[PDB]
Amino acid sequence: SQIVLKKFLPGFMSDLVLAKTVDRQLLAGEINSSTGDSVSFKRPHQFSSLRTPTGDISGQNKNNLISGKATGRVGNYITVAVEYQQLEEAIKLNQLEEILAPVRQRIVTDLETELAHFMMNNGALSLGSPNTPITKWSDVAQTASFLKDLGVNEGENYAVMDPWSAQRLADAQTGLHASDQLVRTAWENAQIPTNFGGIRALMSNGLASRTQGAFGGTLTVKTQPTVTYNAVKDSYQFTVTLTGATASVTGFLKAGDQVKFTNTYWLQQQTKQALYNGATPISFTATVTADANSDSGGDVTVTLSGVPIYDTTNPQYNSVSRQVEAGDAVSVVGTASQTMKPNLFYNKFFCGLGSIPLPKLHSIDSAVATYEGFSIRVHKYADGDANVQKMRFDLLPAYVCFNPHMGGQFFGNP
Amino acid sequence: QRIAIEPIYDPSRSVWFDPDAKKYDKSDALWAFCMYSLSPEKYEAEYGKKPPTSLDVTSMTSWEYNWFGADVIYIAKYYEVRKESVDVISYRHPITGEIAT
Amino acid sequence: TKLDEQFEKYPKFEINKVATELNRIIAEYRNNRITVKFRPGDREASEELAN
Amino acid sequence: TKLDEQFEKYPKFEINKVATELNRIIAEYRNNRITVKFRPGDREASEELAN
Numbered sequence: 135s136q137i138v139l140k141k142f143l144p145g146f147m148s149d150l151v152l153a154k155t156v157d158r159q160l161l162a163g164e165i166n167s168s169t170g171d172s173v174s175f176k177r178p179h180q181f182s183s184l185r186t187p188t189g190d191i192s193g194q195n196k197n198n199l200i201s202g203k204a205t206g207r208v209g210n211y212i213t214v215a216v217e218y219q220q221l222e223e224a225i226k227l228n229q230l231e232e233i234l235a236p237v238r239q240r241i242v243t244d245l246e247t248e249l250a251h252f253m254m255n256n257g258a259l260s261l262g263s264p265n266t267p268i269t270k271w272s273d274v275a276q277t278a279s280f281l282k283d284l285g286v287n288e289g290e291n292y293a294v295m296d297p298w299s300a301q302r303l304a305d306a307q308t309g310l311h312a313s314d315q316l317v318r319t320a321w322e323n324a325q326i327p328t329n330f331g332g333i334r335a336l337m338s339n340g341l342a343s344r345t346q347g348a349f350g351g352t353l354t355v356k357t358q359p360t361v362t363y364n365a366v367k368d369s370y371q372f373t374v375t376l377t378g379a380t381a382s383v384t385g386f387l388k389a390g391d392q393v394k395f396t397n398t399y400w401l402q403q404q405t406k407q408a409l410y411n412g413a414t415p416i417s418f419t420a421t422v423t424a425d426a427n428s429d430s431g432g433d434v435t436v437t438l439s440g441v442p443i444y445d446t447t448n449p450q451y452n453s454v455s456r457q458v459e460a461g462d463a464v465s466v467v468g469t470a471s472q473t474m475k476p477n478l479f480y481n482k483f484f485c486g487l488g489s490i491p492l493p494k495l496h497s498i499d500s501a502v503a504t505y506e507g508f509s510i511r512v513h514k515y516a517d518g519d520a521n522v523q524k525m526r527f528d529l530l531p532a533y534v535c536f537n538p539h540m541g542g543q544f545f546g547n548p
Numbered sequence: 549q550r551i552a553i554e555p556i557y558d559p560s561r562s563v564w565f566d567p568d569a570k571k572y573d574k575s576d577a578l579w580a581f582c583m584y585s586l587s588p589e590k591y592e593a594e595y596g597k598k599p600p601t602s603l604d605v606t607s608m609t610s611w612e613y614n615w616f617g618a619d620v621i622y623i624a625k626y627y628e629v630r631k632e633s634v635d636v637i638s639y640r641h642p643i644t645g646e647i648a649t
Numbered sequence: 650t651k652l653d654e655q656f657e658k659y660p661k662f663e664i665n666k667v668a669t670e671l672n673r674i675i676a677e678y679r680n681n682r683i684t685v686k687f688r689p690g691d692r693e694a695s696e697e698l699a700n
Numbered sequence: 701t702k703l704d705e706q707f708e709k710y711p712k713f714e715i716n717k718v719a720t721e722l723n724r725i726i727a728e729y730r731n732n733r734i735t736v737k738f739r740p741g742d743r744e745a746s747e748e749l750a751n
Contacts (some may be wrong), residue, residue, distance in 0.1 A: 136702065228612075235607075316570075374558060502617070507603075511618075519656075521651075
C-alpha cells in the first residue's frame with residue numbers, strides 16, 4: 135500500500151439549467167465603477183379611458199404620469215479558501231491543479247443554489263397543493279395556461295422539475311396510442327420532448343428545498359394596508375399585519391410561504407377582467423420574503439412580494455378586483471411544517487444575473503479561472519512563517535427582480 | 549474569389565483530428581477541430597453582445613506556467629465531410645463544345 | 650528550506666546549450682526554401698497547363 | 701523503497717544513444733528511393749509493352 139496512482143477517482147456533479155434560462159443580457163457590464171452598487175431600469179406605462187355622451191372632459195381628472203423603477207443590487211462574496219503545508223501538498227500533486235477541478239464546480243453550485251433560493255423567495259404566482267406531486271400531463275400545461283391568461287407574450291416561458299417527476303411523465307408518455315416516434319423515444323431513452331404542454335420543460339437534480347414553518351389558527355388581516363401605486367412603484371412590496379395566529383411562536387412563517395387572499399381575484403392585466411379557472415375564480419397570492427415571528431396576542435407582521443394594487447385615483451394600474459381591507463380572511467397553502475422541493479415556472483424577463491470583475495490584488499500573484507462562462511479570481515499568498523501557504527477563490531454576483539408577477543412555484547393538483 | 553494560405557499558431561493545443569485517421573497527411577479523416585484565442589472586445593465586435601461568452605475547456609495549459617490574463621475566449625472551427633445527392637445538368641449546346649455537365 | 654526561520658530559495662542557474670543545433674537546422678531550411686511545382690505530362694498542351 | 705515511511709522512487713534518467721545509426725539508415729534510404737522496373741525481352745514489340 136505504498137504505490138498510489140495519479141488518477142483521481144470520479145466524484146458526483148450537479149446540473150446547470152438555471153443560469154442558462156434567466157436573462158443575462160440587460161444586466162451585463164452595467165454595474166461599473168461609475169454606477170455604484172446598484173442600477174435601475176424603467177417600467178412601462180398604462181392608461182385609462184373616459185366614456186361620455188359628448189366628450190366633455192372639463193372636470194374629470196385626466197390620466198396622470200407616474201414612472202416606476204426596478205433596481206438590481208450586488209450580493210455577498212462567494213469565497214472558498216484553503217490552507218496547507220506546501221511541501222506535503224507537493225508530495226504527489228504538482229502544479230496545484232488537483233484543487234482547481236472540484237472548486238469551480240463548488241462555486242457555480244453555490245451560485246445557482248442561491249439563485250434558485252432568490253427565485254423561489256421573490257416569485258408571486260402559485261399553483262396547486264404542495265403535498266401532491268406531478269404525475270399527469272395537465273400538471274405541466276396548467277402553468278402555460280396561467281401564463282397565457284395573465285397576458286405575457288414577448289419572451290420565452292420555462293418550467294423546471296426534479297428527476298423522478300420526469301420519469302413519471304415519460305412513463306405516462308409510453309402509454310400513448312398513436313405517436314410512434316414519441317412512444318419509441320420514451321420506451322428507449324425515457325426522454326420527454328422539448329415542448330411539453332406549450333411550455334419548455336426542463337429537468338434538474340440540484341434544486342433548492344425549503345421548510346414550511348409551524349402555523350395555526352384562522353388567520354385574518356387586521357389593518358387595511360396602503361396599496362396605492364405611489365407606495366409600490368419602486369419595489370412591488372407591501373407590509374401587512376395579521377391576527378388570529380398562535381399565542382407566541384418563533385418562526386411562524388418561513389421564507390417562501392404563500393399567503394392566499396380568498397376574496398381578491400386576479401385580473402387579466404390589459405382587459406382588467408377577473409380570472410375564471412373553468413370552475414372557480416383564481417385568488418390572489420403573495421410570497422413571504424423574510425422570516426417572521428408571532429408575539430403575544432397572535433399578531434404577525436409580515437412583508438410580502440407581489441402587491442394587490444387597487445388605487446382609486448389611478449385606476450389604470452389596478453391588478454385586483456377589490457381592495458384588501460380589514461377583517462378579510464387569508465389562508466396559507468401546505469401543511470404545518472413539512473419539507474418539500476418546489477418546482478419553478480417563470481418567464482424570460484423574471485430575474486436577471488450578472489457578475490462583477492475583480493481586480494488583481496497588489497503585490498500578490500494571481501490568476502483567472504473560467505468555468506461555464508463565469509470568471510473566478512484566485513490569489514496566492516504566504517501569510518505566516520509556519521510553512522502556511524494560502525489560496526482563495528472569489529466571485530461576486532448580481533441579482534435583480536423586474537416584476538414578481540411572472541413566476542413562482544407550482545405543484546400537482548388532485 | 550481567391551485562395552489564401554494562412555498560418556496556424558500553437559498547433560499542439562489547437563488542431564485535433566478524427567482519431568480514426570492513421571495516415572501522415574490525415575487523408576482518411578471525417579472531421580477536425582481548430583482553436584484560436586479571442587478577446588471579449590473582438591468577441592463583441594463580431595457575432596453579438598447579447599449572449600454572454602462561453603469558451604471551450606481543455607484543461608491543457610497552465611502546466612507549469614504563470615497566468616495573469618483571463619481576457620481570452622477559446623473558439624474553434626469545425627470541419628465535416630458529407631456524402632450528399634446533387635443533380636447535375638448537362639448543357640449540350642453544340643456551339644463551342646457540346647458535352648458540358 | 651526554512652534556513653533559520655526564512656524561505657531563502659535554491660540558486661537555479663540556466664545555461665542553454667541545446668538550441669544551437671535547432672538554430673542550425675532552422676537556418677539550413679531558411680537558406681533553401683522549397684515550394685510546390687507542377688510537372689507536365691505527355692500531351693500536346695500539358696506544358697501550357699503546367700505553366 | 702519506504703525511505704522513512706514514504707515511497708520516494710529511484711531517479712531514472714534516459715540518454716538515448718541508439719537512434720543515431722537508425723536515423724542514418726533511414727535517411728540513406730529516403731535519399732535514394734527505389735521502385736519497380738519492367739525490363740523488355742528479345743521480341744519485336746517487347747519494348748512498347750514494357751513502356
